[PDB]
């Protein structure tokens, strides 16, 4: 499930504990995103491709936003997902991107979600949160929901592909199978 490389705009967050973070340019502005829980107080040593900075964030809950002006690579354009959004999502870790869903209420990655900080981005490209330590997607608010198992069946309701049989691939414990016909892309992603 892991990307072999982290996308450009990932980096490494280190504060009083480790984390990750993400750089996106969000109404105009360059902004890194991370865990607030990771800062010594509210600063970090953000580092990624090209840039190695101490940033100051803003606070909300858990949820920690920076200017970082200075940020002379990839930060591509973002905007908070709308209330409600429901759909694919992907996990910016530290070890490539990991494909998810959010659902109503919850959360769901197909595995590790990275450090605390690893943003989570919808299939439309607005940022949903990002992870804290299978964990919480803590919101720009400082509102959270929480990684939760997920029916098999429920999952299947976020791919398309004609439906197969799951067949022998086999499924972790954070799935609930409840079924043995999938979509085929959610087959195929299963099996790999």
Same mark, same amino acid.
């Given at each position: 499930?892991?990307?072999?490389?982290?996308?450009?705009?990932? !980096?490494n967050?280190?504060g009083?504990?480790?984390?990750? @973070?993400?750089?996106?340019?969000?109404?105009?502005?360059?902004? %890194?995103?991370? $865990?607030?829980? !990771?800062?010594?107080? /509210?600063?970090?040593?953000?580092?990624?491709?090209?840039? /190695?900075?101490m940033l100051?964030?803003?606070?909300?809950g858990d949820?920690?936003? $920076?200017? %970082?002006? /200075?940020?002379?690579? !990839?930060?591509?354009?973002?905007?908070?997902?709308?209330?409600?959004?429901?759909?694919?999502?992907?996990?910016?870790?530290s070890?490539?991107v990991?494909?998810?869903?959010?659902?109503? @209420?919850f959360?769901f %990655?197909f595995?590790?979600?990275?450090?605390?900080?690893?943003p989570?981005?919808?299939?439309?490209?607005?940022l949903?949160?990002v992870?804290?330590?299978?964990?919480?997607?803590t919101?720009?608010?400082?509102?959270? %929901?929480?990684?939760?198992?997920?029916?098999?069946?429920?999952?299947?309701?976020?791919?398309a592909?004609?439906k197969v049989?799951?067949?022998?691939?086999?499924? @972790?414990?954070?799935?609930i199978?409840?079924?043995?016909?999938?979509?085929?892309?959610?087959? $195929?992603?299963?099996?790999?």
């Open positions: 499930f892991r990307t072999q490389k982290p996308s450009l705009n990932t !980096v967050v280190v009083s504990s480790m984390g990750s @973070g993400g750089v996106f340019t969000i109404d105009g502005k360059i902004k %890194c995103v991370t $865990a607030a829980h !990771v800062l010594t107080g /509210n600063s970090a040593r953000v580092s990624g491709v090209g840039f /190695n900075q100051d964030f803003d606070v909300k949820f920690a936003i $920076a200017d %970082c002006p /200075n940020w002379q690579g !990839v930060a591509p354009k973002a905007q908070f997902c709308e209330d409600g959004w429901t759909g694919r999502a992907y996990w910016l870790t070890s490539g990991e494909p998810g869903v959010i659902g109503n @209420g959360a %990655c595995t590790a979600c990275g450090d605390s900080g690893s989570v981005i919808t299939e439309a490209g607005e949903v949160g992870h804290t330590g299978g964990g919480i997607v919101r720009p608010s400082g509102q959270f %929901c929480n990684v939760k198992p997920i029916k098999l069946s429920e999952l299947s309701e976020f791919f592909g004609p049989p799951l067949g022998d691939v086999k499924i @972790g414990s954070h799935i199978k409840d079924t043995c016909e999938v979509p085929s892309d959610l087959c $195929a992603l299963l099996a790999a």
